[PDB]
Amino acid sequence: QGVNIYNISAGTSVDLAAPVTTGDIVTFFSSALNTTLNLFAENGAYLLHIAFRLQENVIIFNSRQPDGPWLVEQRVSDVAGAGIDGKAMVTVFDHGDKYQVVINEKTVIQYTKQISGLTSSLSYNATTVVEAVTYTGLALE
Amino acid sequence: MQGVNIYNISAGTSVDLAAPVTTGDIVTFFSSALPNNTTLNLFAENGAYLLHIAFRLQENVIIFNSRQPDGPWLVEQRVSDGAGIDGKAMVTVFDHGDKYQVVINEKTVIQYTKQISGLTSSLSYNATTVVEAVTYTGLA
């Protein structure tokens, strides 16, 4: 087990020191909660793509291969608190076959993976700085 | 089932967890205030101190201990002594069933062997204003 803090500027990504695999957590802290958060694989594929669309009253989840087309988009109405301090908490559990996304204390989606692989990179897009904390090495034998 | 819980702990007060912390669960305190004496505690229903972390600066040492509700303090564990997230300090704690791994920011500071088992149903922070607490539970 190990904790890793990060600083992700809007429009950029970070290579994780310790990759996120099955049984691992990742939580983004965002004051700015027009925005997307991403879990990228080594081969540049979007394992999980969270897109917050306000003017559309919906949150979007999708996956894209290294050089492929976007896949089956998953939508959730903005209908889905506050967070730690002055910033929302978008958490993501890597459940192996699914990605559980918890916005603050409320679970918002049980996303059936469209692309397997371990997350070794994270990104945050604008539309200024979000932090991320990775809990890894959580699974025993 | 995995769940995230957020708590705002005022200095000198505790919080009843809406989801107890058991084996395989995590808890992380966010404290920008790192007085020479601060403490963080994982409490059990019966008021026992499953884990007591104390930052003694007039001694430059971190102190880890346990105590039964009625009982006296036990084998105190002392640790000699990076930082950054949001001008805070992150004191994370993993419940490993038999031990408590404490991580101050990204550095694991102690592999504390439990002196008292039980599931954490309470948290408190002391010194004198507010430290936040996030629990990742149900990691079953």
Side-chain angles (χ1 to χ4, degrees):
Chain A
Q1 308 72 52
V3 181
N4 282 277
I5 305 90
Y6 297 85
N7 257 60
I8 305 181
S9 280
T12 63
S13 62
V14 305
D15 282 303
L16 296 173
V20 158
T21 204
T22 299
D24 292 348
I25 310 172
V26 50
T27 292
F28 303 85
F29 297 90
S30 174
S31 305
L33 289 178
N34 180 59
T35 305
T36 73
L37 290 175
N38 298 276
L39 295 210
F40 280 110
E42 249 291 10
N43 60 26
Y46 287 70
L47 276 15
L48 169 49
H49 173 67
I50 313 176
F52 298 73
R53 295 170 184 169
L54 327 175
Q55 181 273 168
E56 300 201 7
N57 304 312
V58 73
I59 305 179
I60 290 303
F61 305 85
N62 223 327
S63 297
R64 187 222 289 181
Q65 283 290 18
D67 182 14
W70 272 106
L71 306 172
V72 186
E73 162 180 271
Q74 295 300 165
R75 330 182 78 239
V76 181
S77 56
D78 287 310
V79 167
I84 171 180
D85 47 63
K87 57 187 59 180
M89 273 178 62
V90 176
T91 302
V92 187
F93 298 84
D94 181 354
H95 291 316
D97 64 335
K98 300 178 173 182
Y99 275 140
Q100 191 195 316
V101 171
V102 187
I103 297 177
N104 276 161
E105 295 186 293
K106 178 158 188 171
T107 282
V108 84
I109 196 174
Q110 274 290 18
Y111 186 100
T112 286
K113 283 185 169 60
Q114 288 185 293
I115 313 176
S116 285
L118 52 179
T119 302
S120 60
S121 202
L122 297 184
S123 97
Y124 157 66
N125 210 334
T127 298
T128 183
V129 168
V130 62
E131 306 103 9
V133 161
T134 57
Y135 299 82
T136 61
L138 294 176
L140 308 305
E141 31 55 80
Chain B
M1 189 183 295
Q2 312 69 43
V4 179
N5 291 280
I6 308 162
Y7 310 91
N8 228 55
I9 303 179
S10 239
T13 68
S14 53
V15 299
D16 272 298
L17 290 179
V21 166
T22 208
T23 298
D25 293 340
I26 299 160
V27 56
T28 286
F29 300 95
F30 303 90
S31 53
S32 56
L34 58 164
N36 40 288
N37 290 295
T38 296
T39 57
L40 292 174
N41 300 286
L42 299 202
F43 279 107
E45 275 265 58
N46 51 37
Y49 285 71
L50 267 27
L51 181 59
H52 169 68
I53 315 175
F55 295 71
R56 298 168 182 172
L57 310 186
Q58 76 271 61
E59 304 174 51
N60 189 288
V61 67
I62 305 293
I63 293 314
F64 305 85
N65 215 326
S66 290
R67 195 189 76 169
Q68 284 293 2
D70 41 3
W73 282 99
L74 309 165
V75 186
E76 163 188 85
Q77 220 55 49
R78 324 189 82 218
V79 172
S80 290
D81 206 297
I85 319 87
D86 188 301
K88 313 199 75 55
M90 286 178 63
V91 178
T92 300
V93 178
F94 302 87
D95 181 2
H96 293 311
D98 59 346
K99 314 179 191 304
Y100 281 129
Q101 168 173 42
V102 173
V103 192
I104 296 176
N105 274 81
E106 287 179 343
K107 185 176 197 299
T108 283
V109 59
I110 192 179
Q111 200 63 235
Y112 188 93
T113 283
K114 295 184 178 174
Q115 299 180 301
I116 311 171
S117 287
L119 53 187
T120 298
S121 81
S122 250
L123 312 176
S124 69
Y125 148 74
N126 212 181
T128 327
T129 287
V130 164
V131 47
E132 295 81 60
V134 172
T135 54
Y136 297 85
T137 61
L139 314 188

PDB file of all heavy atoms in Angstrom, chain A residues 26-54:
ATOM      1  N   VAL A  26      -8.436   6.348  -6.626  1.00  0.00           N
ATOM      2  CA  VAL A  26      -7.914   7.594  -7.138  1.00  0.00           C
ATOM      3  C   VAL A  26      -8.968   8.651  -6.881  1.00  0.00           C
ATOM      4  O   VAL A  26     -10.127   8.461  -7.222  1.00  0.00           O
ATOM      5  CB  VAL A  26      -7.606   7.538  -8.644  1.00  0.00           C
ATOM      6  CG1 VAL A  26      -8.784   6.983  -9.395  1.00  0.00           C
ATOM      7  CG2 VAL A  26      -7.266   8.935  -9.146  1.00  0.00           C
ATOM      8  N   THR A  27      -8.575   9.749  -6.246  1.00  0.00           N
ATOM      9  CA  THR A  27      -9.510  10.822  -5.976  1.00  0.00           C
ATOM     10  C   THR A  27      -8.944  12.140  -6.429  1.00  0.00           C
ATOM     11  O   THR A  27      -7.825  12.503  -6.055  1.00  0.00           O
ATOM     12  CB  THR A  27      -9.827  10.965  -4.486  1.00  0.00           C
ATOM     13  OG1 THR A  27     -10.572   9.835  -4.033  1.00  0.00           O
ATOM     14  CG2 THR A  27     -10.653  12.212  -4.251  1.00  0.00           C
ATOM     15  N   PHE A  28      -9.725  12.851  -7.236  1.00  0.00           N
ATOM     16  CA  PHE A  28      -9.341  14.174  -7.722  1.00  0.00           C
ATOM     17  C   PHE A  28     -10.011  15.188  -6.797  1.00  0.00           C
ATOM     18  O   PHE A  28     -11.132  14.974  -6.359  1.00  0.00           O
ATOM     19  CB  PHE A  28      -9.856  14.442  -9.153  1.00  0.00           C
ATOM     20  CG  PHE A  28      -9.401  13.441 -10.189  1.00  0.00           C
ATOM     21  CD1 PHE A  28     -10.091  12.247 -10.381  1.00  0.00           C
ATOM     22  CD2 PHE A  28      -8.295  13.702 -10.988  1.00  0.00           C
ATOM     23  CE1 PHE A  28      -9.684  11.324 -11.354  1.00  0.00           C
ATOM     24  CE2 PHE A  28      -7.889  12.787 -11.956  1.00  0.00           C
ATOM     25  CZ  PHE A  28      -8.591  11.594 -12.136  1.00  0.00           C
ATOM     26  N   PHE A  29      -9.323  16.280  -6.498  1.00  0.00           N
ATOM     27  CA  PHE A  29      -9.897  17.336  -5.671  1.00  0.00           C
ATOM     28  C   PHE A  29     -10.024  18.533  -6.600  1.00  0.00           C
ATOM     29  O   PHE A  29      -9.018  19.024  -7.101  1.00  0.00           O
ATOM     30  CB  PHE A  29      -8.982  17.672  -4.489  1.00  0.00           C
ATOM     31  CG  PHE A  29      -8.784  16.529  -3.549  1.00  0.00           C
ATOM     32  CD1 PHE A  29      -7.743  15.632  -3.735  1.00  0.00           C
ATOM     33  CD2 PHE A  29      -9.695  16.298  -2.522  1.00  0.00           C
ATOM     34  CE1 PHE A  29      -7.613  14.523  -2.925  1.00  0.00           C
ATOM     35  CE2 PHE A  29      -9.574  15.181  -1.697  1.00  0.00           C
ATOM     36  CZ  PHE A  29      -8.531  14.293  -1.902  1.00  0.00           C
ATOM     37  N   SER A  30     -11.249  19.000  -6.834  1.00  0.00           N
ATOM     38  CA  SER A  30     -11.463  20.120  -7.749  1.00  0.00           C
ATOM     39  C   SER A  30     -12.351  21.264  -7.261  1.00  0.00           C
ATOM     40  O   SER A  30     -13.543  21.076  -7.004  1.00  0.00           O
ATOM     41  CB  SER A  30     -12.026  19.591  -9.073  1.00  0.00           C
ATOM     42  OG  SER A  30     -12.372  20.649  -9.949  1.00  0.00           O
ATOM     43  N   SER A  31     -11.764  22.453  -7.154  1.00  0.00           N
ATOM     44  CA  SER A  31     -12.499  23.644  -6.730  1.00  0.00           C
ATOM     45  C   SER A  31     -13.474  24.013  -7.839  1.00  0.00           C
ATOM     46  O   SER A  31     -14.597  24.434  -7.578  1.00  0.00           O
ATOM     47  CB  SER A  31     -11.542  24.819  -6.500  1.00  0.00           C
ATOM     48  OG  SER A  31     -10.520  24.480  -5.577  1.00  0.00           O
ATOM     49  N   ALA A  32     -13.024  23.845  -9.079  1.00  0.00           N
ATOM     50  CA  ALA A  32     -13.827  24.155 -10.258  1.00  0.00           C
ATOM     51  C   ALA A  32     -15.033  23.241 -10.393  1.00  0.00           C
ATOM     52  O   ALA A  32     -15.475  22.964 -11.507  1.00  0.00           O
ATOM     53  CB  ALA A  32     -12.966  24.072 -11.526  1.00  0.00           C
ATOM     54  N   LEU A  33     -15.545  22.765  -9.255  1.00  0.00           N
ATOM     55  CA  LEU A  33     -16.726  21.896  -9.209  1.00  0.00           C
ATOM     56  C   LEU A  33     -17.458  22.045  -7.873  1.00  0.00           C
ATOM     57  O   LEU A  33     -18.052  23.089  -7.586  1.00  0.00           O
ATOM     58  CB  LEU A  33     -16.337  20.429  -9.412  1.00  0.00           C
ATOM     59  CG  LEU A  33     -15.874  19.969 -10.795  1.00  0.00           C
ATOM     60  CD1 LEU A  33     -15.505  18.487 -10.738  1.00  0.00           C
ATOM     61  CD2 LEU A  33     -16.978  20.214 -11.822  1.00  0.00           C
ATOM     62  N   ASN A  34     -17.714  21.419 -19.280  1.00  0.00           N
ATOM     63  CA  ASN A  34     -16.746  22.444 -18.908  1.00  0.00           C
ATOM     64  C   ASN A  34     -15.479  21.847 -18.294  1.00  0.00           C
ATOM     65  O   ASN A  34     -14.527  22.568 -18.016  1.00  0.00           O
ATOM     66  CB  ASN A  34     -17.383  23.437 -17.915  1.00  0.00           C
ATOM     67  CG  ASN A  34     -16.422  24.556 -17.482  1.00  0.00           C
ATOM     68  OD1 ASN A  34     -15.917  25.313 -18.311  1.00  0.00           O
ATOM     69  ND2 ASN A  34     -16.176  24.660 -16.177  1.00  0.00           N
ATOM     70  N   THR A  35     -15.453  20.536 -18.090  1.00  0.00           N
ATOM     71  CA  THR A  35     -14.283  19.907 -17.478  1.00  0.00           C
ATOM     72  C   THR A  35     -14.280  18.410 -17.662  1.00  0.00           C
ATOM     73  O   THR A  35     -15.330  17.779 -17.662  1.00  0.00           O
ATOM     74  CB  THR A  35     -14.238  20.139 -15.961  1.00  0.00           C
ATOM     75  OG1 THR A  35     -14.292  21.542 -15.676  1.00  0.00           O
ATOM     76  CG2 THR A  35     -12.963  19.556 -15.388  1.00  0.00           C
ATOM     77  N   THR A  36     -13.097  17.830 -17.797  1.00  0.00           N
ATOM     78  CA  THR A  36     -13.016  16.387 -17.948  1.00  0.00           C
ATOM     79  C   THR A  36     -11.842  15.849 -17.152  1.00  0.00           C
ATOM     80  O   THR A  36     -10.837  16.534 -16.969  1.00  0.00           O
ATOM     81  CB  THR A  36     -12.852  15.973 -19.419  1.00  0.00           C
ATOM     82  OG1 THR A  36     -11.530  16.285 -19.857  1.00  0.00           O
ATOM     83  CG2 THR A  36     -13.847  16.712 -20.298  1.00  0.00           C
ATOM     84  N   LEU A  37     -11.993  14.631 -16.653  1.00  0.00           N
ATOM     85  CA  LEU A  37     -10.947  13.978 -15.884  1.00  0.00           C
ATOM     86  C   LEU A  37     -10.674  12.664 -16.601  1.00  0.00           C
ATOM     87  O   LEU A  37     -11.603  12.030 -17.100  1.00  0.00           O
ATOM     88  CB  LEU A  37     -11.416  13.731 -14.453  1.00  0.00           C
ATOM     89  CG  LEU A  37     -11.570  14.967 -13.564  1.00  0.00           C
ATOM     90  CD1 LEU A  37     -12.153  14.555 -12.224  1.00  0.00           C
ATOM     91  CD2 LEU A  37     -10.211  15.632 -13.374  1.00  0.00           C
ATOM     92  N   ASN A  38      -9.412  12.247 -16.656  1.00  0.00           N
ATOM     93  CA  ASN A  38      -9.089  11.032 -17.378  1.00  0.00           C
ATOM     94  C   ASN A  38      -8.115  10.090 -16.724  1.00  0.00           C
ATOM     95  O   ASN A  38      -7.191  10.508 -16.043  1.00  0.00           O
ATOM     96  CB  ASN A  38      -8.544  11.397 -18.756  1.00  0.00           C
ATOM     97  CG  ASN A  38      -9.546  12.149 -19.592  1.00  0.00           C
ATOM     98  OD1 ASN A  38     -10.400  11.551 -20.245  1.00  0.00           O
ATOM     99  ND2 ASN A  38      -9.464  13.472 -19.560  1.00  0.00           N
ATOM    100  N   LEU A  39      -8.351   8.805 -16.955  1.00  0.00           N
ATOM    101  CA  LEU A  39      -7.489   7.733 -16.485  1.00  0.00           C
ATOM    102  C   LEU A  39      -6.914   7.152 -17.769  1.00  0.00           C
ATOM    103  O   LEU A  39      -7.606   6.435 -18.494  1.00  0.00           O
ATOM    104  CB  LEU A  39      -8.279   6.626 -15.772  1.00  0.00           C
ATOM    105  CG  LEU A  39      -9.036   6.836 -14.462  1.00  0.00           C
ATOM    106  CD1 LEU A  39      -9.031   5.528 -13.722  1.00  0.00           C
ATOM    107  CD2 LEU A  39      -8.393   7.876 -13.613  1.00  0.00           C
ATOM    108  N   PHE A  40      -5.661   7.470 -18.061  1.00  0.00           N
ATOM    109  CA  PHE A  40      -5.009   6.974 -19.268  1.00  0.00           C
ATOM    110  C   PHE A  40      -4.146   5.738 -19.059  1.00  0.00           C
ATOM    111  O   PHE A  40      -3.474   5.609 -18.032  1.00  0.00           O
ATOM    112  CB  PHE A  40      -4.094   8.037 -19.841  1.00  0.00           C
ATOM    113  CG  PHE A  40      -4.790   9.088 -20.643  1.00  0.00           C
ATOM    114  CD1 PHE A  40      -4.892  10.387 -20.161  1.00  0.00           C
ATOM    115  CD2 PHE A  40      -5.246   8.800 -21.929  1.00  0.00           C
ATOM    116  CE1 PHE A  40      -5.419  11.386 -20.942  1.00  0.00           C
ATOM    117  CE2 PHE A  40      -5.775   9.784 -22.718  1.00  0.00           C
ATOM    118  CZ  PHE A  40      -5.862  11.086 -22.233  1.00  0.00           C
ATOM    119  N   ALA A  41      -4.141   4.846 -20.047  1.00  0.00           N
ATOM    120  CA  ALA A  41      -3.294   3.654 -19.984  1.00  0.00           C
ATOM    121  C   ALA A  41      -1.935   3.983 -20.639  1.00  0.00           C
ATOM    122  O   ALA A  41      -1.762   5.039 -21.256  1.00  0.00           O
ATOM    123  CB  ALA A  41      -3.955   2.497 -20.713  1.00  0.00           C
ATOM    124  N   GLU A  42      -0.973   3.076 -20.496  1.00  0.00           N
ATOM    125  CA  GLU A  42       0.362   3.260 -21.063  1.00  0.00           C
ATOM    126  C   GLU A  42       0.319   3.493 -22.570  1.00  0.00           C
ATOM    127  O   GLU A  42       0.977   4.397 -23.083  1.00  0.00           O
ATOM    128  CB  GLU A  42       1.223   2.034 -20.770  1.00  0.00           C
ATOM    129  CG  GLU A  42       2.361   2.277 -19.792  1.00  0.00           C
ATOM    130  CD  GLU A  42       3.445   3.157 -20.372  1.00  0.00           C
ATOM    131  OE1 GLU A  42       3.224   3.725 -21.460  1.00  0.00           O
ATOM    132  OE2 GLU A  42       4.516   3.282 -19.742  1.00  0.00           O
ATOM    133  N   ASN A  43      -0.455   2.677 -23.279  1.00  0.00           N
ATOM    134  CA  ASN A  43      -0.553   2.824 -24.719  1.00  0.00           C
ATOM    135  C   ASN A  43      -1.430   3.998 -25.162  1.00  0.00           C
ATOM    136  O   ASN A  43      -1.900   4.024 -26.298  1.00  0.00           O
ATOM    137  CB  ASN A  43      -1.044   1.524 -25.365  1.00  0.00           C
ATOM    138  CG  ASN A  43      -2.403   1.094 -24.868  1.00  0.00           C
ATOM    139  OD1 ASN A  43      -3.206   1.917 -24.426  1.00  0.00           O
ATOM    140  ND2 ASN A  43      -2.683  -0.205 -24.962  1.00  0.00           N
ATOM    141  N   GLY A  44      -1.646   4.960 -24.261  1.00  0.00           N
ATOM    142  CA  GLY A  44      -2.427   6.152 -24.567  1.00  0.00           C
ATOM    143  C   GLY A  44      -3.931   6.030 -24.733  1.00  0.00           C
ATOM    144  O   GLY A  44      -4.574   6.951 -25.240  1.00  0.00           O
ATOM    145  N   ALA A  45      -4.501   4.907 -24.310  1.00  0.00           N
ATOM    146  CA  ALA A  45      -5.936   4.695 -24.426  1.00  0.00           C
ATOM    147  C   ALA A  45      -6.647   5.349 -23.252  1.00  0.00           C
ATOM    148  O   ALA A  45      -6.071   5.468 -22.168  1.00  0.00           O
ATOM    149  CB  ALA A  45      -6.238   3.197 -24.450  1.00  0.00           C
ATOM    150  N   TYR A  46      -7.884   5.791 -23.467  1.00  0.00           N
ATOM    151  CA  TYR A  46      -8.662   6.396 -22.389  1.00  0.00           C
ATOM    152  C   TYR A  46      -9.405   5.266 -21.694  1.00  0.00           C
ATOM    153  O   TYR A  46     -10.470   4.843 -22.159  1.00  0.00           O
ATOM    154  CB  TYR A  46      -9.710   7.385 -22.911  1.00  0.00           C
ATOM    155  CG  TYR A  46      -9.179   8.690 -23.424  1.00  0.00           C
ATOM    156  CD1 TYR A  46      -8.449   8.744 -24.602  1.00  0.00           C
ATOM    157  CD2 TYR A  46      -9.451   9.885 -22.763  1.00  0.00           C
ATOM    158  CE1 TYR A  46      -7.998   9.964 -25.127  1.00  0.00           C
ATOM    159  CE2 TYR A  46      -9.005  11.122 -23.280  1.00  0.00           C
ATOM    160  CZ  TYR A  46      -8.277  11.148 -24.466  1.00  0.00           C
ATOM    161  OH  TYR A  46      -7.828  12.336 -25.009  1.00  0.00           O
ATOM    162  N   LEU A  47      -8.849   4.764 -20.596  1.00  0.00           N
ATOM    163  CA  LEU A  47      -9.518   3.696 -19.875  1.00  0.00           C
ATOM    164  C   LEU A  47     -10.867   4.237 -19.382  1.00  0.00           C
ATOM    165  O   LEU A  47     -11.912   3.608 -19.565  1.00  0.00           O
ATOM    166  CB  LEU A  47      -8.636   3.221 -18.719  1.00  0.00           C
ATOM    167  CG  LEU A  47      -7.543   2.181 -19.015  1.00  0.00           C
ATOM    168  CD1 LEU A  47      -7.261   2.030 -20.502  1.00  0.00           C
ATOM    169  CD2 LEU A  47      -6.300   2.590 -18.256  1.00  0.00           C
ATOM    170  N   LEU A  48     -10.835   5.420 -18.778  1.00  0.00           N
ATOM    171  CA  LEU A  48     -12.047   6.065 -18.296  1.00  0.00           C
ATOM    172  C   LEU A  48     -12.019   7.577 -18.555  1.00  0.00           C
ATOM    173  O   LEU A  48     -11.088   8.279 -18.154  1.00  0.00           O
ATOM    174  CB  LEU A  48     -12.250   5.787 -16.809  1.00  0.00           C
ATOM    175  CG  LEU A  48     -13.339   6.638 -16.158  1.00  0.00           C
ATOM    176  CD1 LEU A  48     -14.607   6.612 -16.987  1.00  0.00           C
ATOM    177  CD2 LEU A  48     -13.606   6.096 -14.786  1.00  0.00           C
ATOM    178  N   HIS A  49     -13.058   8.062 -19.228  1.00  0.00           N
ATOM    179  CA  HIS A  49     -13.177   9.471 -19.580  1.00  0.00           C
ATOM    180  C   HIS A  49     -14.419  10.112 -18.959  1.00  0.00           C
ATOM    181  O   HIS A  49     -15.534   9.883 -19.422  1.00  0.00           O
ATOM    182  CB  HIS A  49     -13.222   9.602 -21.105  1.00  0.00           C
ATOM    183  CG  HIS A  49     -13.519  10.987 -21.590  1.00  0.00           C
ATOM    184  ND1 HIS A  49     -12.652  12.043 -21.414  1.00  0.00           N
ATOM    185  CD2 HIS A  49     -14.594  11.492 -22.237  1.00  0.00           C
ATOM    186  CE1 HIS A  49     -13.180  13.136 -21.931  1.00  0.00           C
ATOM    187  NE2 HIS A  49     -14.359  12.829 -22.437  1.00  0.00           N
ATOM    188  N   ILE A  50     -14.218  10.912 -17.910  1.00  0.00           N
ATOM    189  CA  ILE A  50     -15.313  11.600 -17.221  1.00  0.00           C
ATOM    190  C   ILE A  50     -15.417  13.041 -17.745  1.00  0.00           C
ATOM    191  O   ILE A  50     -14.487  13.848 -17.609  1.00  0.00           O
ATOM    192  CB  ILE A  50     -15.091  11.637 -15.675  1.00  0.00           C
ATOM    193  CG1 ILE A  50     -14.675  10.258 -15.161  1.00  0.00           C
ATOM    194  CG2 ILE A  50     -16.381  12.058 -14.965  1.00  0.00           C
ATOM    195  CD1 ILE A  50     -14.351  10.235 -13.691  1.00  0.00           C
ATOM    196  N   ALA A  51     -16.558  13.348 -18.351  1.00  0.00           N
ATOM    197  CA  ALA A  51     -16.812  14.669 -18.912  1.00  0.00           C
ATOM    198  C   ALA A  51     -18.023  15.349 -18.259  1.00  0.00           C
ATOM    199  O   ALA A  51     -19.158  14.858 -18.341  1.00  0.00           O
ATOM    200  CB  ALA A  51     -17.021  14.555 -20.417  1.00  0.00           C
ATOM    201  N   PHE A  52     -17.772  16.483 -17.613  1.00  0.00           N
ATOM    202  CA  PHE A  52     -18.832  17.225 -16.951  1.00  0.00           C
ATOM    203  C   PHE A  52     -19.392  18.278 -17.888  1.00  0.00           C
ATOM    204  O   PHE A  52     -18.722  19.268 -18.187  1.00  0.00           O
ATOM    205  CB  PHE A  52     -18.315  17.912 -15.679  1.00  0.00           C
ATOM    206  CG  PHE A  52     -17.816  16.964 -14.629  1.00  0.00           C
ATOM    207  CD1 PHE A  52     -16.606  16.294 -14.793  1.00  0.00           C
ATOM    208  CD2 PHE A  52     -18.554  16.739 -13.473  1.00  0.00           C
ATOM    209  CE1 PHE A  52     -16.132  15.412 -13.817  1.00  0.00           C
ATOM    210  CE2 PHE A  52     -18.091  15.860 -12.489  1.00  0.00           C
ATOM    211  CZ  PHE A  52     -16.877  15.196 -12.663  1.00  0.00           C
ATOM    212  N   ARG A  53     -20.618  18.047 -18.355  1.00  0.00           N
ATOM    213  CA  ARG A  53     -21.305  18.967 -19.258  1.00  0.00           C
ATOM    214  C   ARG A  53     -22.472  19.615 -18.515  1.00  0.00           C
ATOM    215  O   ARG A  53     -23.528  19.005 -18.334  1.00  0.00           O
ATOM    216  CB  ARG A  53     -21.816  18.217 -20.496  1.00  0.00           C
ATOM    217  CG  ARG A  53     -20.716  17.644 -21.393  1.00  0.00           C
ATOM    218  CD  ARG A  53     -21.299  16.721 -22.462  1.00  0.00           C
ATOM    219  NE  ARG A  53     -20.276  16.076 -23.291  1.00  0.00           N
ATOM    220  CZ  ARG A  53     -20.514  15.082 -24.150  1.00  0.00           C
ATOM    221  NH1 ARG A  53     -21.745  14.601 -24.306  1.00  0.00           N
ATOM    222  NH2 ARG A  53     -19.518  14.570 -24.862  1.00  0.00           N
ATOM    223  N   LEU A  54     -22.267  20.856 -18.086  1.00  0.00           N
ATOM    224  CA  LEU A  54     -23.280  21.608 -17.349  1.00  0.00           C
ATOM    225  C   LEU A  54     -24.458  22.030 -18.237  1.00  0.00           C
ATOM    226  O   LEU A  54     -25.597  21.641 -17.987  1.00  0.00           O
ATOM    227  CB  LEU A  54     -22.638  22.846 -16.726  1.00  0.00           C
ATOM    228  CG  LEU A  54     -21.177  22.677 -16.295  1.00  0.00           C
ATOM    229  CD1 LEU A  54     -20.641  24.018 -15.819  1.00  0.00           C
ATOM    230  CD2 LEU A  54     -21.060  21.618 -15.204  1.00  0.00           C
TER     231      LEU A  54
END
